[PDB]
Amino acid sequence: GAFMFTSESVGEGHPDKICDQISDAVLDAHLKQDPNAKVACETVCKTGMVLLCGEITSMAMIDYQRVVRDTIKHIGYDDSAKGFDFKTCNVLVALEQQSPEDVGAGDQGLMFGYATDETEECMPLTIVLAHKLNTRMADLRRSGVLPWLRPDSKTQVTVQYVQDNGAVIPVRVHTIVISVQHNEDITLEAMREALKEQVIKAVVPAKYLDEDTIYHLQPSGRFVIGGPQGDAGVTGRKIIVDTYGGWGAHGGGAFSGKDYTKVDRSAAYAARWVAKSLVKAGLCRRVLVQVSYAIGVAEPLSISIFTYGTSKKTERELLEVVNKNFDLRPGVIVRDLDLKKPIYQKTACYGHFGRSEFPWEVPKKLVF
Amino acid sequence: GAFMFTSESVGEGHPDKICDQISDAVLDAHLKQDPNAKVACETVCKTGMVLLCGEITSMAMIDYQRVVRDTIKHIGYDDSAKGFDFKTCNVLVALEQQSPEDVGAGDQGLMFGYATDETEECMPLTIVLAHKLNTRMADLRRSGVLPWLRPDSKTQVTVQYVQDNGAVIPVRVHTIVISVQHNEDITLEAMREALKEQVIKAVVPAKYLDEDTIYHLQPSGRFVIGGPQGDAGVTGRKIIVDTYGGWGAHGGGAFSGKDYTKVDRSAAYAARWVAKSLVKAGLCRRVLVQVSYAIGVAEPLSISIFTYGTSKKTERELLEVVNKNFDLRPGVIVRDLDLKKPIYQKTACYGHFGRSEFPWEVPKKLVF
Amino acid sequence: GAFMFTSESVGEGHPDKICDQISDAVLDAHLKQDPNAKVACETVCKTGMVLLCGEITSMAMIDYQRVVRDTIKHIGYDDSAKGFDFKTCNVLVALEQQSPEDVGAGDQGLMFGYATDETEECMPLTIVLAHKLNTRMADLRRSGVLPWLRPDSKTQVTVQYVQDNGAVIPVRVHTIVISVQHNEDITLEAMREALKEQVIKAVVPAKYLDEDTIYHLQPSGRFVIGGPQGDAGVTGRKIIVDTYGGWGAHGGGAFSGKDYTKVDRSAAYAARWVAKSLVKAGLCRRVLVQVSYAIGVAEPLSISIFTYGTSKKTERELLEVVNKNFDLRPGVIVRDLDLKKPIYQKTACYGHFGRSEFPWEVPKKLVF
Amino acid sequence: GAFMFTSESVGEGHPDKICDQISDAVLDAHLKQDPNAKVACETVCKTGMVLLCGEITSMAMIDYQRVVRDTIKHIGYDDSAKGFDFKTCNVLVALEQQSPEDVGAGDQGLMFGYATDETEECMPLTIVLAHKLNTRMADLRRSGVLPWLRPDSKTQVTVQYVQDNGAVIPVRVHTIVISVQHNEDITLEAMREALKEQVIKAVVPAKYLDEDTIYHLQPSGRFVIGGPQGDAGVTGRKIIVDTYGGWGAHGGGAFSGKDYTKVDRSAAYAARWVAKSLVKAGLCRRVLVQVSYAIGVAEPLSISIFTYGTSKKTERELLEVVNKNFDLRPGVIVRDLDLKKPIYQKTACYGHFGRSEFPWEVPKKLVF
Numbered sequence A, B, C, D: 001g002a003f004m005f006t007s008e009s010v011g012e013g014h015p016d017k018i019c020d021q022i023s024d025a026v027l028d029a030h031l032k033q034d035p036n037a038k039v040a041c042e043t044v045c046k047t048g049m050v051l052l053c054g055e056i057t058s059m060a061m062i063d064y065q066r067v068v069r070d071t072i073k074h075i076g077y078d079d080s081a082k083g084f085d086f087k088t089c090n091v092l093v094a095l096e097q098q099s100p101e102d103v104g105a106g107d108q109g110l111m112f113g114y115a116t117d118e119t120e121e122c123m124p125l126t127i128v129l130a131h132k133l134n135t136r137m138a139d140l141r142r143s144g145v146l147p148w149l150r151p152d153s154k155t156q157v158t159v160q161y162v163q164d165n166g167a168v169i170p171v172r173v174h175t176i177v178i179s180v181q182h183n184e185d186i187t188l189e190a191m192r193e194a195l196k197e198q199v200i201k202a203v204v205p206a207k208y209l210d211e212d213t214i215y216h217l218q219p220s221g222r223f224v225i226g227g228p229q230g231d232a233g234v235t236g237r238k239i240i241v242d243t244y245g246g247w248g249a250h251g252g253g254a255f256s257g258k259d260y261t262k263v264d265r266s267a268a269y270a271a272r273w274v275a276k277s278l279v280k281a282g283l284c285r286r287v288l289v290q291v292s293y294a295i296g297v298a299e300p301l302s303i304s305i306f307t308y309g310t311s312k313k314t315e316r317e318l319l320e321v322v323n324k325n326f327d328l329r330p331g332v333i334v335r336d337l338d339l340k341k342p343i344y345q346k347t348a349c350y351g352h353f354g355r356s357e358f359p360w361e362v363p364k365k366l367v368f
């Protein structure tokens, strides 16, 4: 049933992602000293100008200058020409900090969860590849292998598919577009070559690369001092690269800067969890699980399972399987997924879904 | 095939929407004097602090102080206590302004379009009601009828559905949550009453309100000097309320602040257009049209039509109907949809899809 | 030997003075917990936007949000229309805070000290009156007596003099100009009347007011929402109203935000001290003491005493009196003047010289 | 009558002076297109962050981005490591711009003027040398002769004097302190040597240098990425280096950013003019002319001439010479001194007094 699909991802230095990371680093910094710290913060950045905003009720002593600069350094902004230097940039902190199982969902909400068997991660090939492509250039940047590579990058992967009496099989990577920031002493010709051999061919399965696959490497020519200015970076503006790459459904809630008490984060994670568990348990090849909550109520106000005619069990057979194996009440979610743990910054770039190192990515047994 | 769904929308004073509007007012201000002005700007705001960023290549003389303050005044921030006064707020302009049919799409892209017959607008009931609810309080604010009403509001509408040998029929509004900023001299009891009688019951069809429908009006109590702070307002962070309320598919591109040359805006509008045309022409009851573009190429690199088994014609019958009635090349899109016109600010709040006053919302004939 | 002279002073809400006070409040906040805290900070403000900058090496835990807002509240900005509300203004903190007798002067320097017997304070009548005029409207503002009075004011006092076989005798207040911010419900006519009866006539000695004295009260008409925007307030820009009102000599060093280790502050205070001591001890009627320091050296590198032919003893008789009664080495100065004490914020408005409540204003005995 | 004196001056890249220059470049930019433009602006800066504030009523089209960046480039900030790059720094413009002989002084005021014959410029040796020292390193920076020299510097010159049956004769330069920002590839030993041979000895007259003169070159060691940060740069904070180096009298008014209608600027220039004219006409060796104005009145409300017993004519003989050769009414001052001319930015660094290229520095004939 042929159709094509494109997804994108951004590197650790893309301005928006710089902000998502700093906001989550501030969340990690509080969890380590107070796992009940209430965090609600966001970051805004513009060329060596970082603004930290937010209301956080906690009881931990934090050096925000330190957690902001350390995060910029980790991302790789240490020199001047790169567009950012953690040692010299303006970190204006305008953050306000106070001090002091069957909970109940804050804010009516509707979270979505998605999983597909086209990849071992149970994520769309398109977004999986987009993320790995960025992940790989960071590796090469940090190992020393490609020392011209700078932090800011963008990746787009378009794959041709075909349905299958149920749903979704990738056939080939139709085209790949990558742009990455770089140092001056490196030719456009040398960058393009390294991008194809060392990053693309080193992450994309042979099965998908072709004699026709189109490559668009550094299409706009040069991106040197293109460091994060990107006309103002912001938190919460990369909602689709943080999730499914345009593939499931998304209600609009951003993750970074919000602690584990916000259903937007927790519940979204819980819904991914059940979606991944279901395909993993052989119960379907592709699922879109929809969980609704009602302001005040703890127990979900209606969960819906949408297989795309890819399950043998039948929605409202699969619904019992979920109601017998999962307790999606907010509090139980944070307890089961170990959501008080400072794992948030790693979550802030390269996607929240797909990587197995996250609790919600470990499939539950599922006794059926 | 019962399921439930929730959508949300925000008023003209919600900080993010304040930013989306100012960005598009700056786009309008340029189009009026140079329809070829190249605009790429964003706004950030935080309590009487508005920052305008961006790169715009144009040849028009614009008073940004004037277009930023006029926009805040239009939204309704003229007094102090409201959280914003266009006469006193800091408008820091950091914008850089330069001077000098078969084009070809910039940036590989994948735009989505959606339409459904559950409402005359051809939009999900859930998001249509969410928007109308906010639209109505603005009317009452502006007429004088509810003079305690301030600009910032948030609305959530959750409707119970049932499929139908094809797709999607709303049955009832299960619950409604609304919070709106307000003046001090007005009781929580008086606000709640006016919200039910004068806004909810004056916009939601009798068929959907019930003796059980749940109302959550000003749940968090008061929201007086609330105003646009939300710790920070940003452009491009309300991507789902600008489109389908979590209903079609969304690849991630924001609209406000980008001119008509960006496929993220134009092509998204074009895809809504054909989706709306298709259901209007009786060819399906619900569609998800997917249009792909390839960097450099003008003609779409693959359009996909997904009816949900609600068309009698059959995808790749309906695809010919689209290829015989539409020319989705970028340049033809801006020409046919009159995209050089300064209509953008009206597009910046209450949704981009649904309102008939926009070119992309006038269904094309469709000769089949 | 007739001549005329004018001086000015500003109220606690003048933007520059708001900054001088916040910077010194931050200095007080550190001294109370670490009398060796090394403070070097400055503040910038612009309508409900306060930026705290600086490098301070100390070991005290301080809530800068708290010391900034408390200082704005103390000044009297609690409501919206006033141009500032400590509860709602943006306090962006960009401060960096580290942790860990015969000292020796940092930076070559030349401090000046001045005293005159025309007033009991040993300060020029012109600046003394200018300050008292502002001090009095604050009293009336804070008592309740003139409840329309807002924080920001400016005062200028011009007095006609006559020399006297030595130096300087005030004869009459030639003209007085005062502008003070105010609430809307108060007539220009009522403000002008209260300014003459209740503030001017209540602070200026009858001996100096005349049937000709000129009054310029609220000359520019109304100053209501004239709250601190004053197109950006700053620290260190009110160097002459902080000292002698244009009367001694001033080398350029600002006081606020600098701890007691900076010769600019300490030594200036020490020089005022000896100047006041000398006239107090009957040794001259008017003095300009000049103390020089050499980078690295502790003992002053040359002190000069300039009486204006008003001493009977003779410069270099008076120099021995000073060398026998004072040890102006930096460290001894901070020890004798109790300069580790958090008295700095009170120093930040209404002048550093004149008020007896400050150590440097208590005249030393002087054994001659 | 021996005494010693010290003065200081700062280079074009000292943060405060960066701000004084940008403010005056904005004033120049308006005068060139509207000599009646009413300018009242100030600049604030902090590491690649420049904020332009102010109210200017004018009728000229100005590209503030352009006049701010051109000014930073002129100063010499083009590379990254220098602490500033006009191509990458944040220039946030928050300026508001409107449109539409016997005038009469605005604001009661008291301006001071000073001149002395110890140098051909008729300025204190101490401040003349301090300025020339900075001027010289800029020359060498700009010529290529000392290519390690960066824009930010500070200079202090302390000279030993002796009175003379009238007033003030310099005897020798006691000590000189200079610190200048620099590039990494240059030794402290090489910088110190070049500062003594090529800048100090190339500007200070042999008569004043000695075998004992003390040199303090780059005392704090290195100052590489120093650049303009000083935690913050502001306009109007270098009031004494802009005038007499602590030598005449100063009432407190800053110059930069204020147009020629403000008596603070104009009248201060007028008072320097007569002071310079008087000593030039042989009528005294040292003068302190004091001109007072009354709000509303055009003709000066009392001018006082203080020779220090160095004139043969006698104050109130010299007063007639001034009243017969000068018309210090505000409007006549701007007309005679050609104050509508865009010469202000050159006035913004290296002192307002002393350089003959300025109208107020050309001595008037003086018919006695």
Ligand SMILES: CO/C=C\[C@H](N)C(=O)O
Pocket (backbone or CB within 6 Å): B014, B152, B153, B154, B179, B220, B222, B223, B226, B230
């Ligand atoms: C207490 O109500 C506050 C805020 C509201 N949710 C909004 O800003 O949209």
Ligand SMILES: CO/C=C\[C@H](N)C(=O)O
Pocket (backbone or CB within 6 Å): D014, D152, D153, D154, D179, D220, D222, D223, D226, D230
């Ligand atoms: C270590 O030197 C630094 C700074 C120098 N005094 C200046 O900024 O003027």
Ligand SMILES: [K+]
Pocket (backbone or CB within 6 Å): A041, A042, A235, A236, A254, A256, A257
């Ligand atoms: K967010």
Ligand SMILES: [K+]
Pocket (backbone or CB within 6 Å): A236, A237, A238, A239, B236, B237, B238, B239, B252, B254
């Ligand atoms: K977004």
Ligand SMILES: [K+]
Pocket (backbone or CB within 6 Å): B042, B235, B236, B254, B256, B257
């Ligand atoms: K955007």
Ligand SMILES: [K+]
Pocket (backbone or CB within 6 Å): C041, C042, C235, C236, C254, C256, C257
């Ligand atoms: K200062």
Ligand SMILES: [K+]
Pocket (backbone or CB within 6 Å): C236, C237, C238, C239, D236, D237, D238, D239, D252, D254
């Ligand atoms: K000053």
Ligand SMILES: [K+]
Pocket (backbone or CB within 6 Å): D042, D235, D236, D254, D256, D257
């Ligand atoms: K100024």
Ligand SMILES: [Mg+2]
Pocket (backbone or CB within 6 Å): A107, B219, B220
């Ligand atoms: Mg709520």
Ligand SMILES: [Mg+2]
Pocket (backbone or CB within 6 Å): B014, B015, B152, B226, B227, B228, B229, B230
């Ligand atoms: Mg809000």
Ligand SMILES: [Mg+2]
Pocket (backbone or CB within 6 Å): C107, D219, D220
């Ligand atoms: Mg030093």
Ligand SMILES: [Mg+2]
Pocket (backbone or CB within 6 Å): D014, D015, D152, D226, D227, D228, D229, D230
């Ligand atoms: Mg400096």
